[PDB]
Structures are given as C-alpha cells and as structure tokens.
Paper text:
Here, a simple protein crystallization method inside the features of the [name] serial crystallography chips is reported that circumvents batch crystallization and allows the direct transfer of canonical vapor-diffusion conditions to in-chip crystallization. Based on conventional hanging-drop vapor-diffusion experiments, the crystallization solution is distributed into the wells of the [name] chip and equilibrated against a reservoir with mother liquor.
Similar to the strategy for lysozyme, conditions for abundant nucleation and ∼20 µm crystal size were optimized in hanging-drop crystallization setups. Data were collected from six proteinase K chips and one [name] chip. Using data sets from proteinase K chip 3 and [name] chip 1, structures were solved at resolutions of 1.65 and 1.90 Å, respectively.
Residue numbers in the entry:
A (entry chain A), B (entry chain A), C (entry chain A), D (entry chain A): 2 to 388
C-alpha cells in the first residue's frame, strides 16, 4: 500500500529533484535535468504538480523568443501529464547582483530591479494557474551589525510587498503571497527569521489579507523550535497558505532531507495536525536528494517523501480513532482545555470564591496530568506496536 | 567614570540579587534577602528602581494582615531611598498547582485561579506606581505532542489577556501589558517562543494597543537568534514597552549572566540601537549572580551590569560621531537603504527601463559593499583602539 | 509482547523514579520515595537492578549508626526481590561546598574532602557487588574564563583519578571506573564535555585500563552530536563500560526524557549498534519522569523506557535479517568498507598504477551510493511498514 | 600601532583570500586570484607565510609539465617576498569522486586513490619546507545511519594514517600530521567531530608521536563548545601542532568570519592562553572574506584578522600584569588550583582527619569564590576601560 495519487496533492519544486549536488565544498555530482523530464518522471511517481523559480524554467538573461519556447515546451509537458502548477516564486539570490539582498539591498537600483524581476514572474505564474506566490528572502540580512539598519530594511521590505499587492489588485489577479522564513544561511542572520516574525510583519502591510506564510520543517528546526507548534499558531491566525515538507537533524546547516528523515516524531505530530485541522493546500516537498546519489537514488528519495507522509497519515488516524486514546485524552483533560475559562464573564469570575478564596490549591496540585501514558500510546501507534 | 545615576533608569528585579543559588542539581548557597535590604543596597549602587513578582514581596498563602505589613515595610524603604517601582509581574510558575501552566493549564479551575492571582497583583502594582505589567508564561507549554492542543491553548491565552485588558479598562488603570517570550525551560517547548511569535499573537487580541513585548537578551539567543535584529522589529512595530538585559553564551540552559557577559558584540549593537532609537523605558536587568558568589560578589555583579551598559554607551556614541565612520556608512550605502525604493509609484516603476530592460546587472554586481572595513571600524571603537 | 525480564539487564537509578520534580523555577510536585519501595516497584516492572549515589541511600551528615541501618534496610529489599546493584557513584554536586567543583575545586581542602567522600562510597559499592563506579563531574567547570586554569584543572582531575586507581588496586577491588561526560549545566562549561574528550583524557592516566566511559544519550545531543557515532568510537577503543539511556529534543537544557522519546531514529540506530556489537553491560536509564506526573505516571514512564528498547530491538533485528536489506548493504558497498584498503602494503600501493596513474576518476565518481533506498528500507522496518 | 611583522607568524591559506564567493545558493562574486599575486599582497600586509591545498596550487588533472611550471612560478614568488610555507594539506573533498569520503569512502579503489593523491602532495610539501601536514576529513561521514559502519570507518581511517606515517618515516621526512576536526557540513555528521574525538583517535595509531590536532575556532563552536577549554586540553596533552583562527556566531553553518568577529570574549581568552602557554607555531587564519566584498574588502578583512589578534594580545598582557588582577587571582584561589591535592600520598590522605572527619563543610561552603569581580576586571581590560 502507501501509493500516492494526484488526489493527495503532493508537489515538488523543479529545483529539488533537479539539484546537481553543488554544496559549498564540492562540484556537482549529477547532470542537469530538463524540466520536461522532471515533470514526466514526477507524474509517473504519483505527484500532483510542480513548482518553479523563474530561473529554473527560463535561464537567466534569455531573450523573449527563447523564453517563449521554454514556456511552450513546459506547458506541453503539463498537458501531456495532467500535472498542475500550484505555486511559483522568484530567484532573488543566485545572481551576484543580489549579494546584499533583493527587496532590502542597500543599493536602491538593485531593489527596483528585484521588484521588476518579481512582477515579470507573477505574470507567468498567473498564466500557468498558480494560486500562491512564495517569497524567500534568502539574501535579506547581514553578517555584521553596522551593515543593515533593520528598521530601514523593514521599511523597504514593507514597501516591496505593498507594491506587489497593489500590482496584483490592479491586474485583478487571483493569487496570494506567502513568506517562507529562514533564520540564517546564506546570510549570517536573515530578516523575518521565524514563522512568528513573518506573521507579525504581515499585520503591518496595507492589505494583510493577501499575505500568509510558507513555513518549512527544517527552517524552524534550525532555530531549535517546535515546528508543529509553529504551524498551529499559523493555522490559528488563518495564515497557513502553503507548507514545505522535509527533514532536518537539529541546529546546523540547512539539510533539506527527504520528509520523514530528521525528527520523525515531529513529522508524526505535524501530519496529525495538518490532517485534523483540514489543511487542504498542497503538500510541497522542498528537499535535496543527497549528492551521494545517482539519478536512481533521486527518484527513490522523492518516492520516500510521499511514502513517509502516507504512513504517518495512517498512524495518526489510528491514534485519534483509538477509544483507549480518546479515554486517555479525557484523563489528561484535553477536553477542558477546549472549554472557555470564563464564559461567565469578568464580573462573575471576580465574585466566584471557588476560583480563589476557597480554591483548594493543594488538591489541584496533586492531580497528575497522565501525559506520559498518553505519549506512550502515541509511540505505540507510531511504531505499529499496539496489536 | 562610568558611574550610574537614577537618571540612567537602571532597574533590578528583587528575584535577581535575591537569588539563593538553587539550580536543578544543588542547594542554595546564599541566605534569603529581605526585600527592604535589597532596595537599600541597590539605591546605594545608583539604581533607579526595582521590580517584583507578587510572591517575591508577599510570601505565598499569607493572610491579608501579614500582606498589609509586607507592603508597608516595602513602601517605607521606597520612601527612604527614592526608589521607584516601574514594573511588576505574577509568579505563575513556582507553586506545584502551575505544573501544567497558568493561563493555558488543561484544568479549567487552575486557569481561573491563575487569572484571580494575577488581577490581585495588578491592583498592588497600580498602587505602587507601576506603568508596565509583565507576563512570563514559563509553564505554558508541553514536553510531548499530545498533551496540548496549541490552537485551544492559544484560545485560552487570548481569553486570559482580553479579560485582563477588560479589567484594567473598567478600573481606569494607566498600565500596559508586556509579554516576555522564552523558547524553552522549564517546559520542553514554551508557547509564544520568540519576540516574533509574541508580536503576532498581540495583533489578535481585542485591544492590541494595550500589549507590547518585554524581550530578554538571553532568551532570543537560546534559539540562536540575533537579539538586536529582534529589538529592531519590536521598535518598528511600536511595541518595545520594556526590556530585560543580561548575558548568555549561546544555545543552552538559561544562564542569566550579568549584562555585558555572553555575546559582547551583540551587547554593543543593542545599546547602539536603544540609544539611537531613543528608547526611554527602564533598563532592567533580569540576571542571576552565579551561585559561586557570596553577598559581596552579588553586589559586584549587579554593579557590573550598570558599568558595562555605560561603557558600551560611550563606545557606541563615539562610533556614530566619528566622521570616518559616517563616511564609511555612505560608502556602504546605508543612506540609500533609508530612501524609498519607489516613491514615484508602481506605474512609474513599470515604465522605467533603467530598472530592468536597460539595467546593467553586471556593473551593479561588481560594486563592493565595503562592510568589512565598516565592521572593523566598529571593532576598533568597541575596543577603544582608534587613537 | 515487549515484556521485560531481568535477563534484559535493565537498570534504574534511585534518583530517576525518585525525582521529586524540583526544577530551577518550581517546587517539588511529588513526595520523596523510600529507596526500599523503589526497589520493590522496579522489581515488579521487570527491572534487573538499581544504581545509587551515596547521598541517595544515606542522607548527608548521617551518623555511622544510622548509616548502618540504611544499608541494612536496603540490602534486605535487594534480597527479597533479587535485584542487583551493578553501578554506584558519588554525589559531588548538591551540597554547597561543591559549588566550584569537587576534584577540580580551586580550594585544596575541598578537593581532599571530595576524594575522601568518594573513597568511602567505593567501599560501600564493592560490598553491595557493584562492578562499575561512575564519575559525573557536574560542577567541574566555569562560568567565566579567568576562574579556572584548565591545564591546572586537568592536572587536579588526573591526580584524583590516579589516586582512586591506586586505592582500588591496593585494596584488591574488582571494580572499574567510568566517566560520564556532559557539555554544560549546571556549570556554564563543564570539563571533559564529550565522549571524545573523556576518551582522550583517559589515555593520560597512570592505569588507563581501569577507566572507560558512561555516555548518556541526551548529553552528546546537548552538543548536537551523533550519539550512535560516539558510542561506536567508544566501542572501537574498548571503553564502553556502561551507558545511560534517555531522550532529548536537541540543544537545550538537559531534559532526561524517557528512552525512545526525543530523537527516535537515533534511538533505533543506537539499539542496532549495541545489539550487533554484543554490548553485554547494563541498559541503564538515567531519566526524569516529568513533574506533571503523579506516582502512577512515574511507573508508566519507567515501563515505557523498557518497552521502547524492546520494540526497537525487534525492529533492528528484522532490519538486519531482511535479505533485501542485506542486498542493499552490498549495493552501497558496506562490505568493501570492512575490507582493508592496502593489506598489500605501502610499497605495493605506490607501484599500483590502477590506484592513481590509470584510475578512472570519472567512472568512480559516477557510481551512485544507493544510500537513500537503504535508508528508506530502515524507515519501513522501524515503522513496521514492510509487509 | 598594531602593525604585523613576519615575526608574529601570521599565515593565510591561498583558499582564504582566494575565495570567490560561491556558497550553496549563489554564484561567485569575485574573479579567481593568481597564487603569485596573493603571495605578494599578503607579504605587503605583514604576513609571515601561506598554506595551500594541492588543488589550490596545481589545478586538478594537470600534466607533470604544467605542474612543474606552477611550482616554479610559486617558488619564485616566495623567493621575491621572503614568504614561508609552514603547512600544506590535500583537497579530498571537491571532486565528485570524494562524495562519500576519501580515507573512509565505502569504495576501496577510491580510498587507495585518496592515499596516493595525499602522498604525492606530501612530497611537494617537504620540498617547499612545510613542517606540518593537515588532514581535514570533510567528506568522512554520513547523512543516514545505515550508510556507514563507524567501527569499520575508524579501522579505515586508522589504516590510512598509519600508512602515511610509515611513508614519512621510510623517506626520513621531518614533518608531522595534524587533524582538523569539524562536527558537520558538508556531511550530515563528520567522523572525529571535535578536538576531543581527534585526540582520542590519535592514541590508537601505531606512531602516535607523529600526530596532533589543528583545531579551528569556528568548528568547536559549531557544537557549542568552549574553544579555549579545548585548546587547553590539546596543550595539556602536548598535541597543539597548529591552529586555525577565525570567527563564528554560534551553532549554524560554518561562517569562517575574520578573527575577532563572532565570540569576542572567547577570542580574548584564546589569545591569553596561547601567549601565556608559549605557543610558538603559526597563527593561521582559515577564513572567508564575505561575498559582499570586492577585492579591496578582501585585503581589509585579512588585515583585520592580524590587527584583532595584536589588540587582544596587548589587552591580555595588560590583564595578567595588573597587580590588582594578580591580587584577585589569589582571592579566587587560582594559586591553590595549581598546587597538588595530595602530594603527601594516598595513605596520608586517608589518615588525615582534617580532610573528612573534622572538615568544616559549612565554613568551606560559605567562602565566596570572587569570580564576578575577577571577570569584570577582565572585561575592563578587554574594553580598555581601566584608566
Ligand atoms: Co531548507
Ligand atoms: Co532568562
Ligand atoms: Co542528563
Ligand atoms: Co571553518
């Protein structure tokens, strides 16, 4: 079992399976992939669609004629396979002109070029049917304190995103924006480093309803944070527009391992949350097949992404449907957590002697929470060791 | 030189110099301090004021009569010294009843008790002249994934803070609330773990103008984040109500070292930012004199907090006033960062061929940013090695 | 299934299930446990034995008469249950006299007291049948650079361990020493912070054959290290005398979660290594039942430690016995890794043109390693999703 | 002042100032540097010498004739400038053939090629006058647990280093080997991840006296470790053959910032230790000028490396020469730390009632260590704020 179907909404970036294995210390170990072949190979694996940076699809500096031919070859592959394009984004980090950022580069003319390069690809994204446009400000940041006034940089970041919102509104486009946070790498520190910082920034834009987040498993874990906890706050705010699934082994460089690798229990609690909250967006894999692999290992790693999600989905469903677990959840008072603290109102709480004057603090302190039994039941379900 | 004066607005928590040295592996190494003696000793050192948890001032379970005597003894010490009380907060973490949290405990009756305990101390804070009321949700969190539905917990957290805002409004109190984030410890993960998460949460309250943040140097660094960067976003949003100054040596347990210790360059860039942005609030030290020290080392460590701030203030002022630095800032185009990207508007940017069609991407890519020369000038100023 | 038996050699410290829930921010949530009841309760759970600090068994400052009665009550419980005592250790960290360390305290008279306190408990350990004596230097370290000359401290550390080795040799005791490394907490930095540093230090003692390591899962992970990798180097050196099993969620305070929690895949690879290398020592759990739990949750958490080990043992055995895995291991050339690089000798390697002059570097570069397929087979086995 | 002279023994790798700015997300921002020009430019800056990988000097795949011309052009630049070559090393990480390692690659023929490539460059190093040969096993490691049997890998690592030692002995070469540890990146985990693991491994080689360590500031800090503490253990063992100086801002990707940047207080305590222990080897800078910089910023960053060392040297000397500091060191009993615990021997310690039976544990517990006053004196000296 555990066979993906386009109904599962699994998507892959062209840059993921297409990664050649260039890391900061070694040359590429794999030849470049034609975007057309990647689309065909992913379709055979059961994927729902692909995503792209502008420069993944149209090589940098291409003429409007060559650009025309690239889009046509790509769209023919989409038609031949039934693959969708739910998301697109801009490469504002590879070319040396972006070495100090795009939207927040110190040089004003670089910032204007970064906006024009973005707007050009929004047009293409809408043509191809994308519903979400992702922004990863990988070069927005600094290695030293004096190089960037962060208040001025946030002014420039806000100005860029308002202008992009004004453009999609004036064009009548049906597309939303999602910010993909990352705490560091390639810059020493990157602006808007976590999901929380991105959510706070969004509330200061002119049209906040146009903007959400695209959190990535590995990036929040590069700051040692609880990724399921962060996704829950994003859902609670109504801002989970998209999500990047992969693996990461703690606080170190951005590994981009296949989903399921890294923190396995965190992946279980993530799928539990996404499935019970009814997240209906794409399940997007932003990962890198290790450079030890040939092309056969590339497709095996991409297949593993989808397989691990489906296994975890099965185990999280069985966990929540188990009547013994439902009983344990009541023993830990998860049901009381969901009830209002004071629906009777402030004045009733103040006049309630059972809440303070006559509250038996020692009797309440004595109640065990029963969390460890519940967590071992979750472990048994994850490992398939219930019976 | 480097002598503090109450005009410098340096404050200390009673729990800081009063810490007895109890850590998870060892007994206390110092006897308890009378709050009256701490106020007198801090006044002699040049401090501006003190802060307190309710249970620092009035021992838990005290009668209304003993409580009366404690407040009176305290206020007499404030009058004898001229010390102020700019901030107060609630202890919702020491007593075993709070072992699963206060505002977000699974048990509903514990949540109601936590609200009543808080409201009682808001009354006392206003009486004593506090302008800011701090909330540190140290027990709001979890060690395992099934123990806490984070969406429900955020519902309960929002409900608590709205009720507190409704109370201070109905009483006509002139006091604001500040959330002090912490990523972990004592809980495995703590809700609202960074300044960003706290800022985002605040925008969902009913009266957001009543709530800001109280970031602590060490806590953002426990997630490997750039503390000056986070303070800048808090200032940019208008939410820096208060700040906790200390030291921390990277990602590990919460050290609470004296300010200046830990990341020294981060402390320099922090003081630069606070002084140039015109932060006018208290400079509050939330620190622990190491348990290796006797009472003489306690007062030496508290004196060092204030000394290091004043030295860093002098060096950051000299850095910004140096005409060679002002020249280097222009060489790195910090002046262009502060200018609007597109004050001419979206339509003018789209019709501007110098921004894309005729932009010389290679000429712009060739410009060095000159950041390293600027950063060595900052190092020379920090070390007093200019000449 | 998954029922422990004393044949599985599972052991627990008295301080583990006996932990009262005192953390740096809150009072104890559980009453103290009689060591006799802990022995009886662990025997019922299927445990093989217990371990103890001197001060866990005999309260500090006890007379030789009360000490006599404590040992007698304890030994009667061991006889009534069949429980063993394979390991003992000294508490050189709780009492305030040890606030700057024991073996490496700056004060010479404290160092001499620390040696005498240790020697007294070695006598008791041998009487009770312990084969390993563990040393955790939790207070050996510093919060600041000038407080400790590390070369002098290592001189004092070496002097202490040589003296202990001279004592057990002169007494004819059959006991070995094991060092338990920890990188930090409670001290800002702790000496001998990892398994590697401890192994290197041991080679400088007078009788190195008497000393090995007692690594703990959580402690190596507090430095972001690969715990299975560290255990493999300890086995390779012949120094794995003992091991502490628990869980930890990355780089933060020492969590001491039940084994299986934390990094689940790391726990799988650990059990694989221990079982295939034929580690025959105790499987010791150095963990803390969370302070949210009552006594029922304490025993459930201890039962979970043993259960998770037995599940992981089953899955690692099935992984290694799978002929498809054995085939994949050959596809990744694990068999070639085990063969000598140059058994033909140096001169034969130099005269071998197939090793350099005629080596086809591009043909070898093209071979995929097939690691991702192998790792997904390990994931399928871990999750019980093979079929 | 603060002007370097070749007497200060400052060295730079050709790959440092020669770094083109290729990181995992962006193209190079600087053109390649001729090794001859780098030697001339570093000589003008006051450097003592340079170091090189084989492939830095002789491009990969070069004929024996072109190789001859490269060495000749290089040696002429050394003669024209007076620059020395104290250290050389092998590139066993860039070419795709090394994607699973060199000495510990699973494929046996790759391991033999890696040994031959190394031996060829040892010949060149000795010709050029190098005294130390550095080994950085950047590709020795794994991303997943099943890919590498670490015991077998350590067997292959030991076999490689013994063979290299047999070669330099048979040739009568006067050169030593130094291992440069790194915990991760580019591999998920790297073998021998810290200075401690490298020191322990060395004691298992056939000729341990031939091997030491080359620790790097940033690498130990990528595991959150205290770099001065690790250097002290390396000195204590007699194994500090060489050292790499740079900066790093905590646990994240390998930043390789200029020395002085990153953890400034750690850099102060490092220079204090190196200068007081009489380290006489090269002061080598393994750093990367940020890719934001042009060639002018490259030379400014390299000049800053040497400047910051000389400033820190001055401040550490003034700290140790201050009679008030010498007094504070006695107040903290640093003098007692250096005295033997029990030069009177074991039997005298056992018969000494002042060490246990009559030891006043409470009087000793009451003595403050006075560490905070001492550490603020060190801060005052570092900042030049004594007077
Ligand atoms: Co990533
Ligand atoms: Co703190
Ligand atoms: Co532990
Ligand atoms: Co490095």
């Amino acid at each position: 079992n555990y066979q993906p179907t386009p109904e599962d909404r699994f998507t892959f970036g062209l840059w993921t399976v297409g990664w050649q294995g260039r890391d900061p210390f070694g040359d590429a170990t794999r030849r470049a992939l034609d975007p057309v072949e990647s689309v065909r190979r992913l379709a055979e694996l059961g994927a729902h669609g692909v995503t792209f940076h502008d420069d993944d699809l149209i090589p940098f500096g291409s003429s409007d004629s060559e650009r025309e031919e690239h889009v046509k070859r790509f769209r023919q592959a989409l038609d031949d396979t039934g693959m969708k394009v739910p998301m697109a984004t801009t490469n504002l980090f590879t070319h040396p002109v972006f070495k100090d950022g795009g939207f927040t580069a110190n040089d004003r003319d670089v910032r204007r070029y970064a906006l024009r390069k973005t707007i050009r690809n929004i047009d293409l994204a809408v043509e191809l049917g994308a519903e979400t446009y992702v922004a990863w400000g990988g070069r927005e940041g600094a290695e030293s304190g004096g190089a960037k006034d962060v208040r001025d940089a946030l002014d420039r970041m806000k100005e860029a995103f308002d202008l992009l919102g004004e453009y999609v509104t004036s064009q009548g486009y049906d597309i939303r924006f999602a910010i993909e946070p990352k705490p560091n790498e390639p810059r020493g520190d990157i602006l808007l480093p976590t999901v929380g910082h991105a959510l706070a920034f969004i509330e200061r834009l002119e049209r906040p309803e146009l903007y959400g987040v695209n959190p990535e498993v590995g990036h929040e874990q590069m700051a040692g944070l609880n990724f399921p906890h962060g996704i829950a706050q994003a859902l609670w705010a109504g801002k989970l527009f998209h999500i990047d699934l992969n693996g990461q082994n703690g606080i170190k460089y951005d590994q981009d391992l296949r989903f399921g690798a890294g923190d396995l229990r965190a992946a279980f609690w993530l799928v539990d949350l996404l499935e019970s909250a009814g997240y209906s967006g794409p399940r997007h894999f932003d990962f890198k097949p290790p450079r030890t692999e040939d092309f056969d290992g590339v497709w095996a790693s991409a297949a593993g992404c989808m397989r691990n999600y489906l296994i975890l989905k099965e185990r999280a469903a069985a966990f929540r449907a188990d009547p013994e677990v439902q009983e344990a959840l009541r023993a830990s008072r998860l049901d009381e957590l969901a009830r209002p603290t004071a629906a009777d109102g402030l004045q009733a709480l103040l006049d309630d002697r059972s809440a303070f004057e006559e509250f038996d603090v020692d009797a309440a302190a004595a109640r065990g929470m029963a969390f460890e039994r519940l967590d071992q039941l979750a472990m048994d379900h994850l490992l398939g060791a219930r019976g």
